[PDB]
Amino acid sequence: DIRPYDPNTQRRVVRERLQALEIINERFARQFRMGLFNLLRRSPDITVGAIRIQPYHEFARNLPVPTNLNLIHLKPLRGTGLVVFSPSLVFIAVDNLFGGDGRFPTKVEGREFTHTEQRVINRMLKLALEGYSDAWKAINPLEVEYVRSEMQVKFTNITTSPNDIVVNTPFHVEIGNLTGEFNICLPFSMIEPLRELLVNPPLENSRHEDQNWRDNLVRQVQHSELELVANFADIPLRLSQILKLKPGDVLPIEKPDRIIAHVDGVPVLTSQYGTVNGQYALRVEHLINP
Amino acid sequence: DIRPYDPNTQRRVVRERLQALEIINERFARQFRMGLFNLLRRSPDITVGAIRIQPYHEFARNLPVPTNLNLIHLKPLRGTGLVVFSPSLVFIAVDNLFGGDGRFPTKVEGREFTHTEQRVINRMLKLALEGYSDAWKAINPLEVEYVRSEMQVKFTNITTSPNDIVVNTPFHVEIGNLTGEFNICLPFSMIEPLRELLVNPPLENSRHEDQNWRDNLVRQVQHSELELVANFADIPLRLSQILKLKPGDVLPIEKPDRIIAHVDGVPVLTSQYGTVNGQYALRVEHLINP
Amino acid sequence: DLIMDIPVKLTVELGRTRMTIKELLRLTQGSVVALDGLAGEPLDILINGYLIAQGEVVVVADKYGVRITDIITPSERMRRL
Amino acid sequence: DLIMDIPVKLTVELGRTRMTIKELLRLTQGSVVALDGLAGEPLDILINGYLIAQGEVVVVADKYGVRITDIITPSERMRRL
Amino acid sequence: IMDIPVKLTVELGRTRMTIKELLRLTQGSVVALDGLAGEPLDILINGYLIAQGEVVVVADKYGVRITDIITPSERMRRLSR
Amino acid sequence: DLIMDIPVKLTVELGRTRMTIKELLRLTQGSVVALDGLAGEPLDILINGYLIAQGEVVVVADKYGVRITDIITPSERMRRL
Amino acid sequence: IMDIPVKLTVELGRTRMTIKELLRLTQGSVVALDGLAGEPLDILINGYLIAQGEVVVVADKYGVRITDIITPSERMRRLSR
Amino acid sequence: IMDIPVKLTVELGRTRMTIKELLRLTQGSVVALDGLAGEPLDILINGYLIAQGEVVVVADKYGVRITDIITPSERMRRLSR
Amino acid sequence: DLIMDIPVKLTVELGRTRMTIKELLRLTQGSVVALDGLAGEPLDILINGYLIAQGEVVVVADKYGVRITDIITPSERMRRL
C-alpha cells in the first residue's frame, strides 16, 4: 500500500445507499411511463437502473455524442441538475410522434437536434419534470424549472470540477422492439443537505410527528453536562525553554481582560474573571454566537 | 447456550394471546362477508387464521409481489395500519364484478392494478374498513381513514425498522371454487397502549362499571404505606478511601439547601430539613411532578 | 488489587417514615413531615443502598461535614435487617 | 481491609462517537449513526464510568454478556483520554 | 443554536453486582447484564441517556438506528432498578 | 537535538465546571458562573491539552505573571487522569 | 398522579396458631391455613390488602386474575377472625 | 481597496502526534497525516485557512483549483480535532 | 531533561505563492492558481510553522504522508526567509 501519490488520482470512495432517492426514482419512472403513454399513445416500460455515484468526468465520458442535456433548477437547493435524453430515445419519440410506427431500424449516425426535434425534446422534458416533481413531493416538495439545452458535455460543466462526485440515475425505456435510455444527473452537493433524508425512507406518518420528535430531542439533550475550560492566559515559548524550565520561574504574560470559555477547544463565551465563595468564577459578557 | 451474539439476530420473543383482537377479527370477518355478499352478489366464507405476531421484515418477506397495500389511519392511535389485498382476491373480485362467472382458471402472472382495478380495490377496501370499524366499536370506538395504496412492501415501510414486531391477521376467503387471501397488519406499537384490553375480553357490562372499578381501585390503594428515604447529602469517594476509611473521619460536603425525598430511588418531593419534637422533619416545598 | 480507585457514590439518608398514599397526595406547600430519626441521632450512610457507616453532622470551620461515628458491622447489619 | 460486600455498577459500551449539535438535531426517526469502533472489536466494560476491562459481546441464554480478554493494564490508559 | 460537540455513547446494558464476582473475574469469566438480548441499546449524550435504538452493522461497522426517544416514566423505571 | 526550538504554545486554564445544556443556553448578560478552582489554588498549565505544570498568578512589578509552583510528574498525571 | 413503584404481593391464606406447633414444625409437618381451597387469594399493596383474585398458571408462571375489589365490610369481617 | 501582497499557502493536511515519532524520524520513516487522500487541500492566507480546493498539475507545476470557501462551522470543526 | 511526552502539531505544505489583493478578489469559483514549487519537488514539513524537513508526497492506504529526504540542516535557512 506504499505507493507514491500522484495528482488526478480521484480515488473518491464515498459509498452510500439512498433508499429515498431510489423510491423517488421509481415513482418518477411510473409517472414518466404514464406521461409517455399519454403523449406517444403507446405504452412504454421503464426500468430504473442502479444509481451510479460517480465523478462528473467519469459520468460525462460515457455519454454518447451528440445528446440532449437539459439544465434544470432544483429550487430551493443551490445548484442545477441535468436531464440526459439519448439520441435513440429522441429518435424513437420523434418517429412515433410523426407517423412512423417504429418498425424501421433505428439509424443514429450522430447529428444535432432540429427545432422540431427540439420541440419534441421540450415536450417530453416537461412531462419528465412534472413527473419528477410529483415523485419528489411525497418526500420533499421542490420546484423544477427548465434552464436550457445543450448537445455537448462541455457545454454544461455541471460541477465546479470534473472530479466532483455526482449522482446519476439511468432509465431504460422499451416500446415494442425499440429501446432507449435517459438519465438524471444531480450533483452530490444538491443532496448533501438532504443526505440524511435520502439515505433512509422509514417514515410515513411525519408532518407534526417530526416536530414532536425534534422537541423531544432538544428537551432530552438539554440534560447533558459539558466541559467548560477557561484559558486564563496564553504564553508562547520555545522547546529549549520548556526543557530547561524549572519550578519558581515566572513567565511574562499580556494581561487577559477577557477570558474565553471553550469546550473541547470550541469557544463558548467571553467573560470576566473573579473570585466568589472562595472559588474562581466567570461573569459572562457575551456568548460565542456568529 | 454460550454462543457469540451477532447483530441481525432478532430473537424477539414477545408471546401474548389477544383474545379481544381475535373477537374483533371474527366480527370484522362476518361484516366483511356480508359486505362481499352485498357487492359481489355472491356469498363468500371467510376463515380467520391464527394471529402472527412476527417481525415486520418477516411478514413482508412472505407477501407476494405485486400486491395491494392500503395504508390506513387508526385514530387516535399514533401510527398507521395496513390492509393487504392479494392478487388472487382482487382478480376474483374483478372477474365476478365484470361479467366473469369465475369458472375460468385464475391466471395471476404478476402485474400492477389498473385504474378500474384500483376502483374495485377502493370499493372493497371501503367495505372492509367500515366492517373493521364496526367490529372494533364494541370494544373501542375509533376512526379509520384510507391513506393510499402501494404495490411493493418497500413502498410502505410500515415500521420504523424492519425488525419491529408487528401483528398480522390473515383471512382466507372462498367463493365457490375460487380461493383468495387478505391480511390486516397493525404495528405492535399501535396496540401497546391497549394491550391490556386486547389480551382479555372478559367484560361486557362496563360503561360506568369501569369508572366504579377505577374509583374503588384508587380509594382502596390509598391505604398503602410507602418508604420515604431523604438523601441528606451526596459525597463522591474512591474505593481506596472507602477501604482506608476509619471512624472519626470528617467528609467534606456541599451544603444541601434542598433535601430530595424519594421512594425506591424515585424522588417524591423537594423540601427543607429541620428539627421538631426532637426528630428530624421535612417541610415540603414542591412535590416531584413533571 | 486493581480495584483501588473504582469511583463510588456515597449517600447519607436523613430519615425514614411510614406514611400512606392519602396523606402522600395530601402534602401541600409548607407542610412539614417528620422522620423517624431523632434530632442528634447520627444519620445513616449508604452506598448503592447498603449500610456502610453511621455519621453525624458536625460544624467544621463554617463547613458542615459528616464525621463517622462508627463503621458498620455484620452484626448491626443483621439487627437493622 | 475487607469492607468488601459493597455492590457496584457494571456497564458495557458498544461504541462511542464525537458528534455535534446541528447533526444531533438533524437525527430523526430511524436515523442510524455509525460507531467509531470497527465491528468485532472488544467492547468496553466500565465501572461507574471507569474502564478496567475490554471484551467482546456474547449472548448467554438470551442474556447479554461480554467475554473479557484484557483487564488491568493502565499502560494504554493515557491514549483513551 | 450552539455548535458544540458532545461525546455520544451507546450502552449495551446494565449490571448490578457486588465485587465478589468482580474480584473473581478473569479471562473467560461469564458475566450477565441486566438487558436481555433483543431490546434496544441505550443512546447516552455525555453519559445522559436520551434514546433507545437497535444495533446494526453497516460496512463492517457498528451503528445504531434510533428507534425511539425515551420518556421520563421509562427513564425512571430504568433508574429505579 | 534539532528540536531545541520547536515553537510551542503554552496555555493555562482558569477552571473547569460540570454544567448542562439548559443553564448553558440560559446564561445571560452579567450572569456569573463559578469554577471548581478555589481562589488561591494554583491554576493548571497545559500544552496541546496535556499537563505540563501548575502555576500561580503573582504580582511582578505591576506585571502579573505565572510562577511555576511545581512541575508535573507521571504520578500526579495518573492521579488527575 | 404519582409514578411511584409499589411491592404488590399475593397472599394464599391466613393461620391463627400458637407457637406450640411452631416449635414442633419440621420438614414434612402438616400445616392448615384459614382459607379453604377454592376461594380467591388476597391481593395486597405494600402488605395492605386491596382485592381478591383467582390463581392461574401462564407460561409456567404464577399469576392472579383479579376477580373483585374488596369492600370495608368484607375487609373487617376478615380482620375480626 | 488596499493593494497589499500576501503569502498564500496550500496545506496538504494536519498531523497530531507526540515527539516520540518525531525523534524516531529518519529518511524513509513513514508518516501519516490527518487528511485522507481525495479531500480538498486547505488554502491559507498568511497562514489563515480561508478555502478548500483540489490539486492539479499544470505545465508540470503544482496548482490548486479552489472548490469552495470554508464556513465558520467547518472551520471550528477542523480546529476542534 | 526528558520532559518529552508532549504532543506536537505537524503540517505539510504543498506549495506557496505571493499574490495580492486584486488577484485574491478576482479569484472565483473553480479558479486555479499555480504554485511556485515545480511538480515533484519535496514538500515542506512544518512544526507549528517551523520547517525542519523536506519530503515528497505519498499515499499510504488512502492516507496522506510524506517521504522525507532532508531533515536537520540550517545551512539553507537563510535563503527560505
UniProtKB/Swiss-Prot annotation, chains A, B:
Pfam assignment, any one: FliMN_C
Assigned keywords, A-Z: Bacterial flagellum, Cell inner membrane, Cell membrane, Chemotaxis, Flagellar rotation, Membrane
Domain of life: Bacteria
Gene Ontology molecular function, alphabetical: cytoskeletal motor activity
CDD domains noted in UniProt: FliM
BP GO annotations: bacterial-type flagellum-dependent swarming motility; positive chemotaxis
Subcellular location: Cell inner membrane; Bacterial flagellum basal body
A Gene Ontology cellular-component term: bacterial-type flagellum basal body
Entry annotated with the keyword Transmembrane: no
Membrane topology: Peripheral membrane protein
Effect of residue 122 to E: Altered motor bias with clockwise rotation, partially suppresses a yhjH disruption
Signal peptide: none
NCBIfam families cross-referenced by the UniProt entry: fliM_switch (TIGR01397)
Family to which the UniProt record says this protein belongs: Belongs to the FliM family.
Protein's name according to its UniProt entry: Flagellar motor switch protein FliM
Gene source species: Salmonella typhimurium (strain LT2 / SGSC1412 / ATCC 700720)
Swiss-Prot record, chains C, D, F, I:
Keyword Ribosomal protein: no
GO BP term, pick one: chemotaxis
GO-annotated cellular components: bacterial-type flagellum basal body; plasma membrane
One annotated GO molecular function: cytoskeletal motor activity
Subcellular location: Cell inner membrane; Bacterial flagellum basal body
UniProt entry keywords in alphabetical sequence: Bacterial flagellum, Cell inner membrane, Cell membrane, Chemotaxis, Flagellar rotation, Membrane
Protein's UniProt keywords contain Cell membrane: yes
Superkingdom in the source lineage: Bacteria
Membrane topology of the entry: Peripheral membrane protein
Function of the molecule: FliN is one of three proteins (FliG, FliN, FliM) that form the rotor-mounted switch complex (C ring), located at the base of the basal body. This complex interacts with the CheY and CheZ chemotaxis proteins, in addition to contacting components of the motor that determine the direction of flagellar rotation.
Family under the similarity heading: Belongs to the FliN/MopA/SpaO family.
Entry protein name: Flagellar motor switch protein FliN
Residues of the full protein shown: 55 to 135 of 137
Swiss-Prot record, chains E, G, H:
Subcellular location field: Cell inner membrane; Bacterial flagellum basal body
Protein topology in the membrane: Peripheral membrane protein
Any one GO CC term of the record: plasma membrane
Keywords: Bacterial flagellum, Cell inner membrane, Cell membrane, Chemotaxis, Flagellar rotation, Membrane
Biological-process GO terms, alphabetical: bacterial-type flagellum-dependent cell motility; chemotaxis
Keyword Cell inner membrane: yes
GO molecular function, one term: cytoskeletal motor activity
Role played: FliN is one of three proteins (FliG, FliN, FliM) that form the rotor-mounted switch complex (C ring), located at the base of the basal body. This complex interacts with the CheY and CheZ chemotaxis proteins, in addition to contacting components of the motor that determine the direction of flagellar rotation.
Family of the protein in this entry: Belongs to the FliN/MopA/SpaO family.
Protein name as annotated: Flagellar motor switch protein FliN
Organism, scientific name: Salmonella typhimurium (strain LT2 / SGSC1412 / ATCC 700720)
Full-protein interval shown: 57 to 137 of 137
